[PDB]
Amino acid sequence: ELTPAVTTYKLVINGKTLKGETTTKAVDAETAEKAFKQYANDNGVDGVWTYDDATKTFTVTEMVTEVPVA
């Protein structure tokens, strides 16, 4: 391999208003994670994440910010 070997990673977004899937190509999982976290935040989705190295898939589940209701 003379050239950088890139892998395709997937992101599943389970958000309040953003939903779906996207992909990115990166040299490693760490790079893909950084790209995905940046994308999610830029799009107003912040939450809890999972990653499966077997499927090269990250999932973000958005955490809702609610106010009290007495």
Side-chain angles (χ1 to χ4, degrees), residues 1-18 20-24 26-33 35-70:
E1 328 169 318
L2 214 56
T3 66
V6 302
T7 299
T8 296
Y9 295 83
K10 291 150 285 313
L11 171 72
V12 174
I13 313 95
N14 179 209
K16 189 199 181 64
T17 59
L18 200 196
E21 194 177 337
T22 194
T23 63
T24 202
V27 301
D28 60 13
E30 293 279 318
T31 302
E33 183 183 357
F36 291 144
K37 284 181 174 178
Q38 185 189 120
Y39 163 78
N41 174 258
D42 289 351
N43 287 293
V45 173
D46 299 277
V48 283
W49 288 79
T50 65
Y51 171 58
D52 190 346
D53 196 56
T55 67
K56 304 291 180 299
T57 308
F58 291 86
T59 304
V60 62
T61 299
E62 186 176 8
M63 290 200 292
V64 302
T65 279
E66 81 128 33
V67 295
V69 57

